[PDB]
């Protein structure tokens, strides 16, 4: 189980630079729930 | 109790001594984001947004494994956390980082710090999740214009001033925000 | 200065007597127990000596508060003064150097004695409270060294002994969780008065007034009168300090100062 | 006058200060059988008389075998001294006899045919006194299931003592147990070890010292109320313990439970 | 030391403040009438409902009033004695209630080398054992008996016989001789001091045959002596169970003894 | 991180596991159960231990337990059943299991030897080891024995499964051993071990952990208890385990801190 | 009344070791040993006793330093305590005439000592009026028995009263002795044991003077080596004569 | 001069003396009349003792007036004396002890040393009033 | 002043006292020597009691003259002080006790507060002649 975690770790460690910040804030405005955190996947 | 009237927010249950005092205070204040006593854009907000975009765009995610990902994200994001409190033109700030500041609302010309009014004001009054740290506030004062309106807004961590600052390419706030991002590393 | 305070207590203005290290605390060296065994194999109490211009308090327990709730034992001790003070600059050192060595001390009833072999910890949540007439004026926690009191007359020292969190074996030998105790725990404070300002007359360690008056009363061998207790024992003097005594003491200090510049 | 409400008491370090105490001695048999006289008591009496102690104040109660003396040791007397004849083969019983009669046990009775039980603190023990005790104990997990023993009968438990008259078990705290003895033979009482008892002094005449009173392995102290002397003729042991009986008496103290002021504090 | 006997209490009226064990004793009549084998467990589960955790109630059995009389024993933070009423066992009921409800401190007694006396009014003599027949004699100043010639015992003035337990009071101001049944009983000279709150008595049936002091002027009925009527033992037990909070409220625990004997022997 | 220096530490005055039991076989023989280890595991769970990490090891005789002794476990409580016979063996056994022994090998067919410090001993282990000695003059000549002889030697031990040999120092000695039966390592004691606690059952605390006569240093690790049945001992062990844990510390060599400082 | 301001070594032994070593040259061995250790030749000696109690017969102490090895034996324990008490303090003794006088004690420092060939010790504590207390003044068999056929006896009796004595003057000698203090010039080492020896019959105190050492063993060569290797410590713990 | 000009019994805290030339401290140690095991163990009759009894008396002179000049707690003088004596390595003088040792000085206090000390302390008292 | 000034033994009713600051009441409760039928029930010789005996003293200082200032029951100074302080919501001062609580004052009578009393009471009298 740990292995997928490590792969996703490597992935997340390189998607911290290719993210936007303005849109990040403007997202953080809206509230998230169970329905929009894993049901739009 | 570090201050007066022990309030279950200052015990020692869990650099000089004051730093450690405020640090054991700050790791506790981290959970004030868990109990609905904030007035701005909390840290866990930034954490949640990073989690959102990252778990959406990625390719190795799977419904098999979303659990324990959400958990580790919840309990390792943002290792360096700050907090500030307001009282009558007089604000103070503490964080686990290993520092502590105090200064005045009119002009951000630092005031030497006290740790006994501090604990009282925090444990009762509304706590605002710092999102722009003191380095950044002082600098933004220096090289960029400042309005007392703008200042009330920033100390409030207002959305408008934040986003407008982002859109104006103002580099220091961008660098602070990117530092926050690069903190969310799992 | 002294003629001036005289003319002021004549002119109805706030009087002022400055002093270096005043002997304001009366002499009384006594102890207090909260729990007692007739053989002293289980105790809990306090000791304190208040002499000259300083006080040394020390609260002790044999169990190191193992049976007590949440591994904490409280200690209180209060001292009232018979004359309020002003703008005091107090010094506070956490210890009892006077109560730090094994003693043999006499019981309360007076037939036998008891033992003391304490081992020093540092006191936690030390609170010193300088209250005025039942009103908090100065309160100090989590701090030692030199502190300041603007207007106070009643001192409370409250301190909690905390059984340590975790101990190296040589320590775990010290405080056996079972009943027999083979060493004793103690934490304490010391409070010293360097400089002060008062409304009345007092005895310092830098003026010959008290000295000269006692000496001349002796030399001319005056019998005892109903105001001055016998032998100028400053203890009895300051024990029941009261108006008429105060006035006559101001008088004698004044006239002795008058004498001082010329007599030598 | 004001009892049972523990209020502080002011003493002082300011004033220096410038009979009815009854010794109550016990003794074992083979000593006597070797003494070869019926007046020895009277000689001890007259000696104590010359030492400053009244005649008719000292009494001699005799115990036959150590295991016999283990039952019901109500040693009620102003001051008590127990000379035990040592054994190189009967040790644990001496240690537990010392433990019992030198400490104060406040105990409540049990009915093991019905109730589960469980010890509470490191100061809670189970004393068991009588003729021939054969303890049968069966530990349990959290919902009453046998562990190493079967609860659907009685003869598959784990015994901890056989052919013992007086034995004081200590059990793992915080777990329930099933229990069996013959409740027409001897009795078990659940005692809390309240505080040390000071009425008694036990001295041993024989081999090496073994005495410890704490069932704690780490703490094996040597109190003062436990003394040891050698011997090859019991006469000298008696004579000598009377030669220093002054020091012995000064070591012990009045029983802190019967002092007219220990009222409403557990036995008075 | 003395816990504070000479440093008095300080109090106020202006301040607003707004595992223990319990035993039972029942005569074998109940063990007969019950006709069950699992009953004590039911009683346990019940005292659970009323507030006792499991492992905090024990039962003891005595077969006669006379049998329980010798060498009393107590076993819990609170002792409840359920006494059956009878019409020819009255002095025994009162003597047992006096002994267990009241404190005693006594010295041993002999017949060999002394005479004996009470120094005051509030002292008594207690006799317990297998067979206790007590005869007594007072004297004059002449060391001579009045009503019993000092040398002959058959014409003595007996007070006790065919009995297990006796608490006698003789007159102050004279030595005494006694024909105690020595090897078949035992006697002590006790001083009662004050009441105790570690025992209570519930008398089933009968009409208050009790006195706790042999004083004719003071037959002080207390709040701990309770009396209910019975024709069915289960009703008695239940009804006791229903007011156990009340009974605990009537007793107090700070007076427990260390030994299981309800008095204090001090040679 | 920063090893290999002796770098002074500052401070101030304001601020899984394994429990490991060895037992003699005669015990479990007296027990006649087999699931017992599982029972005591459940009990250690109840006192707070993780399920499935506590190990019990079984030795036939204390002699056997003496040869090839190896403890590798976070917390070791070793029981020993006394006998009035092996007082030397048990003393030197507790010794070997109380210290840190810096050891090097030896070849007694090619050199001489010595003891150079008072913390130096010659330890021997093997099946049937029986060593003989002959001290040597400053001229490398034998006394009461000759390097050519092997029988005029001075016998010091005999078929002892183990022996801790010591002599007067600053003086050479030619020895006699059987190396394809026994090994003798030159060892130096350095400090006390915190991974071991020796509970003796039966006896009177007779240990001596030094060849020093002048003192019999008694410590907080050599505990004693009495017995009439084995489950008695095991219950005392399990219930009272916490104070024992407080006695024995983490192996001061174990922590990744002693690296290149004669780390184990 | 003074104001301040801020060599011969002896090692005694029982015959068991003598037999055990099976040599007749060990003397020179240990000698040269001490030589290398920093002593001069002819400065150390040796003396044998047969058995423990026999050593108590006319004990010889004469040496600048005294180190006594004692072997454990169960059935002679109190007697080993006796020998220790004898050679641990300094006794000063005065005679006693039992067929001519009547003796008391006055001190907790006043003991009775009995040494010699062999004697039995029987005494009766006397009344004030010279009458037999629980025995008869004149009868020799009525008396009470405090020692039977013993090599050394350290008798003590309660003070204040008189005691008529009886022993075999034919075969023993008793001295009324008083202690001045410790015999610092002597030290003792037991083998095995359980710290079962003390300097007082006193029940209150039996504190171990740092002169009573203890060692385990299996063979005597190791024992002698362990002693001699640490002559330095044995020296500093004790002092020189007089 | 052998005349008991001030005498006191067990009085503590503060006292005054009009004049005096020697101090005598006479006290008496008393064995405990009645004791308890905790004391009884550590106060034995036997010769090798563990503890040792003691009683201590402490005295501090606080205020005084004298006719002979001495070095005080507040003075600026003796500092000036020692410093001017050290500054240039002045050769040790025929009468002054080395380094202005107060111990060696008050060891033997001579009239001529007295007058020298007076002159020097006076000129130092003058010195202070100019350069602090 | 640590001295006994005036006495009264077995005098009842009204008395006069010159100068005092402390009152001491020492009184004895006596058992009756003889009791008629009604009494024995009130006092059983045994330890169980129902009715308890008690003796009381009532002490009223009718009138006097004080050398300091105090309030009273026949003037109106305290009331005016308190009212005028209560009305306009004056923030309490650092010296006076809250609400001019008279008892809290008296429990801790301190000279500064005393002189402040005297001042405000003179001012109250001043007001008291103008608009009653």
Author numbering:
A (entry chain A): 494 to 534
B (entry chain A): 583 to 596, 605 to 776
C (entry chain g): 134 to 397
D (entry chain G): 51 to 68, 77 to 326
E (entry chain F): 51 to 68, 78 to 326
F (entry chain I): 51 to 65, 78 to 326
G (entry chain H): 58 to 63, 79 to 314
H (entry chain h), I (entry chain f): 266 to 397
Question: What do the study's own words say?
Answer:
Rotavirus, a non-turreted member of the Reoviridae, has a triple-layered capsid that is assembled stepwise in two separate compartments in the infected cell: the virus-induced viroplasm and the endoplasmic reticulum (ER). The icosahedral inner layer of the virus, composed of 120 copies of VP2, is in direct contact with the dsRNA genome and encloses 11 copies of the viral polymerase VP1 and a similar but undetermined number of copies of the capping enzyme VP3.2 The intermediate layer consists of 260 homotrimers of VP6 arranged in a T = 13 lattice on the surface of the inner layer. VP4 is a homotrimer of three chains (A–C) associated in an unusual asymmetric arrangement in the infection competent TLP form.
Local refinement was performed to permit deviations from the icosahedral capsid followed by classification without alignment to eliminate low quality subtomograms (54.87%), as judged by the lack of secondary structure detail in the 3D class averages, as well as unoccupied vertices (9%). Classes of subtomograms that exhibited strong secondary structure features were further refined in Relion followed by M, generating a final map of the VP4 spike at 4.9 Å resolution. Unlike previous reconstructions of trypsin digested purified particles, the in situ VP4 complex contained additional density adjacent to the prone trunk domain, which could be accounted for by rigid body docking of the head domain of VP4 (middle). We found in the intracellular TLP additional density associated with VP4, likely corresponding to the missing part of one subunit in the cleaved TLP, as suggested by a previous report of purified TLPs prepared without trypsin. The structures derived from in situ TLPs and gradient purified TLPs without exposure to trypsin unambiguously show the C-subunit head domain located at the base of the uncleaved VP4 spike and that this form of VP4 exists within the ER in nascent TLPs.
